[PDB]
Design a protein around this ligand. Structure first.
Ligand SMILES: O=c1ccn([C@@H]2O[C@H](COP(=O)(O)OP(=O)(O)O[C@H]3O[C@H](CO)[C@@H](O)[C@H](O)[C@H]3O)[C@@H](O)[C@H]2O)c(=O)[nH]1
Length: 412
């Protein structure tokens, strides 16, 4: 079990966001952090590199620090054989009731947890937060003296029975269980001690920070995107249920009335995700040689900062997921003032205020209508975008994220 000490976002402090949330909110914040002044608020997880959870803590910990709380972040150490099992635990918990949990695995898991628990006495802190499965087992290797919080970053409405009955012996312990949406909350738990906390976006990160016109254009000219013609875009992982083929249908139907429209299929995916790289190949084959369609991924060098450019350069953003988690991509788009068109699923139904900040469609032909509407009526589009930005500012920003936690500690 290592520790953060440093960070990457730098010395992020509530002040760096003053301009974004106004002083009344920075105040309202500091207030809620006085009643928790000089306290212990530790975070534990699998890694500080790959992941959004990691990307969130790098900004969140410093932030908690600079507000009066002695935040601190410890990570977990383990051999490949430990992560692979957890990779399984993961997909097991998110459905896929074909994986088998065995004693070899249980022993390994619990042991890794028993060991990494002999490095830092977690029970000594005023409050403890454990992120995701991997370290859930820690809670039974110390005697509770303070509240323990379990933060879940995955779905738990239909988990692999075998695996949930095991993990649950750890989760049921913690004082509160935190889920992104009110659908990931397993019944085996006590709804009274459960907390809904949508994730958030950090306005100042690579993925969401305001770039300069010139850089956007460089990134555009680099992947052959014409900023002078209309652009529609869907940012998402390449899997069978993100509506990627529907977006292609939409782009084609729209293209009949607007022959210059361009479709941007953006998406970063790990090199060990065959499932993903196979749907990716399938997509290119379906698109055929229509180069007005740009398939942008990390293979070709697309990353957070490039994705940033692509979203900003878009006229309309789509998210035709058929099955979705919270949908941070919809959030980023809303932050950049873009009207989103998407399906009523998971987090997408909660973020989009139909008719106000974007539209919720049921199929592709309806998605086609609104895309043409918006394209034809830019001022309207600009409107929905502004509102969408406000919605995020007031609801899904890393500061409203923290303030949510602060609310959780004063409620213990
Ligand atoms: O191709 C991609 C895909 C994701 N992102 C980033 O990831 C975020 C969007 O994530 P979404 O695409 O919102 O993530 P989900 O698909 O909703 O993640 C689901 O699946 C995960 C496991 O794979 C679970 O842990 C989550 O709880 C579950 O919601 C955005 O902020 C992006 O910065 C990219 O930049 N490019």
């Amino acid at each position: 079990m290592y520790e953060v000490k440093e960070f990457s976002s730098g010395k992020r402090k509530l002040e760096d966001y003053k301009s974004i949330i106004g002083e009344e909110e920075v105040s309202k914040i500091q207030e809620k952090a006085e009643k928790l002044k000089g306290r212990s608020f530790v975070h534990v997880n699998s890694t500080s590199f790959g992941g959004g959870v990691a990307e969130i803590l790098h900004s969140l910990v410093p932030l908690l620090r600079s507000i009066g709380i002695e935040a601190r972040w410890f990570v977990i150490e383990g051999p490949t054989e430990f992560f692979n099992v957890t990779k399984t635990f993961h997909n097991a918990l998110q459905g896929n009731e074909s994986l088998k949990l065995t004693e070899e695995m249980k022993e390994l898991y619990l042991n890794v947890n028993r060991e990494n628990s002999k490095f830092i006495d977690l029970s000594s802190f005023d409050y403890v937060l454990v992120h995701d499965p991997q370290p859930a087992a820690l809670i039974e290797f110390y005697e509770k003296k303070s509240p323990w919080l379990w933060r879940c970053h995955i779905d738990l409405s239909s988990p692999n029975r075998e695996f949930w009955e095991f993990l649950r012996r750890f989760v049921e312990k913690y004082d509160r269980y935190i889920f992104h949406l009110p659908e990931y909350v397993q019944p085996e738990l006590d709804r009274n001690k459960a907390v809904i906390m949508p994730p958030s976006i950090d306005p100042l990160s690579e993925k969401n920070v305001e770039l300069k016109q010139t850089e956007i254009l460089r990134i555009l000219e680099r992947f052959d995107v014409d900023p002078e013609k209309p652009i529609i875009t869907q940012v998402s992982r390449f899997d069978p249920w993100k509506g990627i083929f529907d977006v292609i249908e939409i782009y084609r139907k729209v293209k009949e009335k607007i022959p210059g429209v361009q479709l941007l299929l953006v998406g970063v995916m790990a090199h060990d995700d065959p499932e993903g790289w196979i749907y990716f190949e399938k997509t290119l084959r379906k698109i055929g040689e229509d180069y007005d369609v740009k398939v942008l991924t990390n293979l070709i060098g697309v990353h957070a900062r490039e994705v940033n450019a692509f979203q900003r350069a878009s006229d309309v953003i789509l998210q035709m997921s058929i099955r979705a988690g919270f949908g941070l991509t919809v959030t980023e788009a809303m932050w950049k003032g873009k009207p989103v068109i998407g399906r009523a699923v998971g987090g997408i139904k909660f973020q989009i205020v139909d008719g106000e900040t974007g539209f919720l469609v049921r199929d592709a032909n309806e998605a086609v209508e609104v895309v043409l509407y918006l394209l034809k009526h830019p001022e309207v589009s600009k409107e929905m975008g502004a509102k969408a930005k406000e919605r995020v500012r007031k609801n899904f920003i890393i500061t409203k994220h923290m303030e949510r936690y602060l609310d959780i500690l004063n409620s213990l």
